[PDB]
UniProtKB/Swiss-Prot annotation:
The gene is RNR1. ATP binds at T33, D37. The record marks Y721, Y722 as: Important for electron transfer. Induction: Cell cycle-regulated with highest activity in S phase. Moderately induced by DNA-damage. Its EC number is 1.17.4.1. This is Ribonucleoside-diphosphate reductase large chain 1.
């Protein structure tokens, strides 16, 4: 029997007994001690619709539930995980590394009493559950680790015997200022710590040995988390000589199906595995037409492969030819060699000479276009990365010719048969640097704090290089030579909302520029400090950075100037930098979900959407918007139905102030010419590239075309990650009572009741957080 309503009503503070009503919660449990608490948090989540303070309630339950059924003290949890004898095989299967177990035990007091277990309450219910499902180490399908333990372990995984640097990293991470990529969270501090995310693999040689070494290498990388970009330009097309000849070659497709099959094989079950390769190919390759279609559902199933992602490595020349209405030539790399191995002008000269001497097959440039746009429309792929932009604007340009990007399209690093480029990723939580004035009515953005934290994260990523467990020797060889690194961001969208800036506003335009300028400056500064401690990276001498050319110099752009570039440039030219690259904003698909923020630099895709199961299927509304509507009095069952029929859009309510409407525009409602502008803006502070998705409502070849041509002309590197499309008719949905949903436009809003800080911009010379004291 029950009076658990007591256990539940205990956990509300900053509540409101009319908003919440712990009584109502118990009733909705219409059906051991732990089973009830799960449902208590489940149902209590369901009512996020009822009131936004139910989210907070459901988090508390799940969290202090986790506490009850879990060992409080860090060192003991570390013991258990280290001592784990495999339940069914009798033999020692430890989950902490020997090294980190020793550090923990040697420093148990200092460590144990640094943890603040309250900080477990910093998680969205859904964020918590994401951790719980895949990240918190489990003993016998029982969660062993609290969130705080996962963080300490990760901190020790990165810093080793540097307890000071670990305590710091523990603090910043537990306060959600930043986070490391999924592989780091999984594997830091474990027997073979593979913590890197991306690997760019070169197809070793156009031969069975070549192909099968690459395959083995890919299998090894993929099985230890971490995803692949694989360029395959050098492999002969359909119908090409083979010694032992009668056989003409079967081309790429058969090969691709071998890779596809391995991708599926290695993904064995209980996921941790980005079982996902992207393949990179230049559009002159004679098998391009088939390659491009790899992901389509209809058509011939022999010629298809769905665990793989096609990605275009595009020369300017191709865009030039489709832009006039020119010809385009397809070649087998055996007949037209070295094309993948030069760029810009050197490429146009070589390519063109091959054209003139009648090699390869002439076709209409716009015919390939067309096929490309067609695949993108149905499949979201192939990706577009501009090969000349990458190679002209890379700090690594002295290593040779960069032939690919990675699985998402953010990292751009040299790679060759014997050098597999690797990269470590973390993202900064942008909302974390908002500061509110005392009085609650003016807000500010702390670029100094941000600069600081980015230096911390630069130092972490740099240490992972040394502590990482490389799955293949080509990876280690490369990473020790060039020491690249990838910082990215998350929660851009939440911070525009929090600051009441419309995504496409002038204020947001400028904040975007400022955030990115400061992170680039921070990481370069930290990296110069590390060169002064451990020497430059092996390959620094002769790089563009060594001649004092920073990224924005390659784009012929004067920096915004919030930070002193003249000093840094001089320092770098004299001391060097530890890392060859530092910036590559990634999709933060899983990490942003954990931290409870929007994807990355993307606008919110929808103000209403579903979250995963557990006794039903969950409808949920944008938290900032929800509180705004509740504060405007407007929030109805009815407002909720209206929202469900407009699929989260707010743009139809005459009801609601324009400001609100501008603030809550959706990626579908925002000009793509704006998204690309902002991308082009931050790009000048990006070493590498960023994972730019594009979104279209009623897609037409035409807006799709001008989208590509626009990015390309602004000199972007990643023209397009995925293409995300939405029929105009999807934009509207059924609801169970359409006329209740209509009455919602008749609700009358306050305004004298909705207040929200107002943002004080900073400039290249005026801070702002400097001049406005913050709260506590």
């Amino acid at each position: 029997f029950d009076k658990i309503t007591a256990r539940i009503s205990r956990l509300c503070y900053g509540l409101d007994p009319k908003h919440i009503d712990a009584v109502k919660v118990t009733q909705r449990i219409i059906s051991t001690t732990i089973e009830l608490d799960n449902l208590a948090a489940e149902t209590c989540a369901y009512m996020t619709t009822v009131h936004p303070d139910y989210a907070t309630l459901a988090a508390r339950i799940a969290i202090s539930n986790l506490h009850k059924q879990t060992t409080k003290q860090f060192s003991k949890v570390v013991e258990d995980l280290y001592r784990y004898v495999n339940a069914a095989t009798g033999k020692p299967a430890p989950m902490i590394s020997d090294d980190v177990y020793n550090i923990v035990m040697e420093n148990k007091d200092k460590l144990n009493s640094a943890i603040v277990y309250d900080r477990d309450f910093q998680y969205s219910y859904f964020g918590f559950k994401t951790l719980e499902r895949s990240y918190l180490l489990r003993i016998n399908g029982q969660v062993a680790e609290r969130p705080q333990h996962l963080i300490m372990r990760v901190a020790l995984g990165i810093h080793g015997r540097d307890i000071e640097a670990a305590l710091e990293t523990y603090n910043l991470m537990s306060l959600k200022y930043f986070t490391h990529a999924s592989p780091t969270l999984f594997n830091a501090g474990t027997p073979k710590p593979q913590m890197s995310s991306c690997f760019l693999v070169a197809m070793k040689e156009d031969s069975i040995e070549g192909i099968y070494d690459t395959l083995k290498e890919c299998a090894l990388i993929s099985k230890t988390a971490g995803g692949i970009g694989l360029h395959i330009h050098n492999i002969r097309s359909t119908g090409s000589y083979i010694a032992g000849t009668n056989g003409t070659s079967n081309g790429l497709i058969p090969m691709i199906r071998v890779f596809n099959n391995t991708a599926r094989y290695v993904d064995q079950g209980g996921n941790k595995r980005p079982g996902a390769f992207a393949l990179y190919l230049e559009p002159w390759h004679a098998d391009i037409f088939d390659f491009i279609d790899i992901r389509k559902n209809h058509g011939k199933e022999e010629i298809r492969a769905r665990d793989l992602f096609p990605a275009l490595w595009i020369p300017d020349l191709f865009m030039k030819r489709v832009e006039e209405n020119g010809t385009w030539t397809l070649f087998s790399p055996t007949s037209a060699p070295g094309l993948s191995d030069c760029y810009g002008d050197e490429f146009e000269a070589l390519y063109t000479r091959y054209e003139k001497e009648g090699r390869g097959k002439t076709i209409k440039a716009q015919k390939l276009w067309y096929s490309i746009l067609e695949a993108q429309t149905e499949t979201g792929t192939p990706f577009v990365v501009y090969k000349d932009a990458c190679n002209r604007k890379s700090n690594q340009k002295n290593l040779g010719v960069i032939k690919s990007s990675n699985l998402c399209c953010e990292i751009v690093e040299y790679s060759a048969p014997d050098e597999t480029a690797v990269c470590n990723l973390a993202s900064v939580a942008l909302p974390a640097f908002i500061e509110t004035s005392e009085d609650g009515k003016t807000s500010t953005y702390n670029f100094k704090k941000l600069h600081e934290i980015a230096k911390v994260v630069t130092r972490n990523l740099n240490r992972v290089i040394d502590r990482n467990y490389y799955p293949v020797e080509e990876a280690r060889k490369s990473n020790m030579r060039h020491r690249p690194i990838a910082l990215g961001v998350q929660g851009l969208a939440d911070t525009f909302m929090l600051l009441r800036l419309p995504f496409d506003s002038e204020e947001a335009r400028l904040l975007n520029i400022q955030i990115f300028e400061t992170i680039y400056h921070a990481s370069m500064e930290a990296s110069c400090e590390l060169a002064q401690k451990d020497g430059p990276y092996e390959t620094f001498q002769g790089s563009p950075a060594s001649q004092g050319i920073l990224q924005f110099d390659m784009w012929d752009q004067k920096p915004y100037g919030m930070w002193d570039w003249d000093t840094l440039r001089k320092d770098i030219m004299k001391h060097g930098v530890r890392n060859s690259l530092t910036m590559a904003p990634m999709p933060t698909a899983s990490t942003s979900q954990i931290l409870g923020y929007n994807e990355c630099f993307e606008p919110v895709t929808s103000n209403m959407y579903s979250r995963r199961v557990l006794s039903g299927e969950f409808q949920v509304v944008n938290p900032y918007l929800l509180r705004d509507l509740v504060d405007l009095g407007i929030w109805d069952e009815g407002m909720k139905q209206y929202l469900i029929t407009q699929n989260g859009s707010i743009q139809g309510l005459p009801n609601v102030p324009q400001e609100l409407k501008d603030l809550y525009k959706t990626v579908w409602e925002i000009s793509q010419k704006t998204i690309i502008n902002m991308a082009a803006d931050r790009s000048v502070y990006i070493d590498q590239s960023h994972s730019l998705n594009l979104f279209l409502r009623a897609p037409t070849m035409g807006k799709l075309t001008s989208m590509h041509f626009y990015g390309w002309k602004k000199g972007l590197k990643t023209g397009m990650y995925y293409l995300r499309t939405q029929a105009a008719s999807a934009a509207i949905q059924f609801t169970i009572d359409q006329k209740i949903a209509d009455q919602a436009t008749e609700n009358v809003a306050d305004i004298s009741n909705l207040k929200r800080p107002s943002y004080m911009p900073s400039s290249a010379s005026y801070a702002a957080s400097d001049f406005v004291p913050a709260a506590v």
